[PDB]
């Protein structure tokens, strides 16, 4: 009933019954207003919900909650390079925060049954080659557990 | 290079990846624990940096000041040393116990801070609907002692 949970700093036990609402956040501190930021978040699939339907649901939420949200592209995505790589989808989108036009990539994967793992890159400027390389190397370098 | 870089491996429950050195980790772990009470118990793990000339007790002092602003009827009930892990890798820190009113409901809060990663602070914050008694303190401090630093 106790099972291990790992963070960067070490590891501890949690009851099997827990729900993980952790959000990993990585920023270039002091230069947030020009630099991309990275985010990893977690979610659970609704009954009979597959990953495409999950992404549709999230797209509709962002249309609802964010400023003038617009999806720019949608394509397959992969986290890792081995036979155990996560196979999922990604979108690119923009939305408005005050004067700023925020640019985002988000990639969703079912890492274990019923549980979605979401990688997000957020930039205060349109994507450039540097941001694209960051995004693609981040996903390719991911090493799934187990 | 092929054997490593100034960039740093980073681990989450679901796997690991390389985090470029320029990034600061501001992750917030949130775990909703099992419970049938009106409010669920939860564990929060956050990361912080000490301000210039701020030690760990002073850091705790700063977090209490922020609690008073955001949480209804916040009262500190206890303050004591804390230990995360055991053996040579054990982390010596500090902790508080406190109460506040989440809604119309009284809940019970622990916060324990440590210097796990050199030059950073790791903060465990427990929110529970169940009052702290000797048994609860035992189970909490025993759980802290079981932490295995990386």
Numbering used by the authors:
A (entry chain B): 1 to 146
B (entry chain A): -4 to 145
Task: Share the article's original sentences.
One such pathway is the type VI secretion system (T6SS), which in many bacterial species functions to deliver antibacterial effector proteins from the cytoplasm directly into an adjacent bacterial cell via a one-step secretion event. In contrast, DUF1795 proteins, also known as effector-associated gene (Eag) chaperones, interact with so-called ‘evolved’ PAAR proteins in which the PAAR and toxin domains are found as a single polypeptide chain. Crystal structures of Eag chaperones in complex with the TMDs of cognate class I and class II effectors reveal the conformation of effector TMDs prior to their secretion and insertion into target cell membranes.
A comparison of the chaperone structures in their apo and effector-bound states shows that upon effector binding, both chaperones ‘grip’ the prePAAR-TMD region of their cognate effector in a claw-like manner.
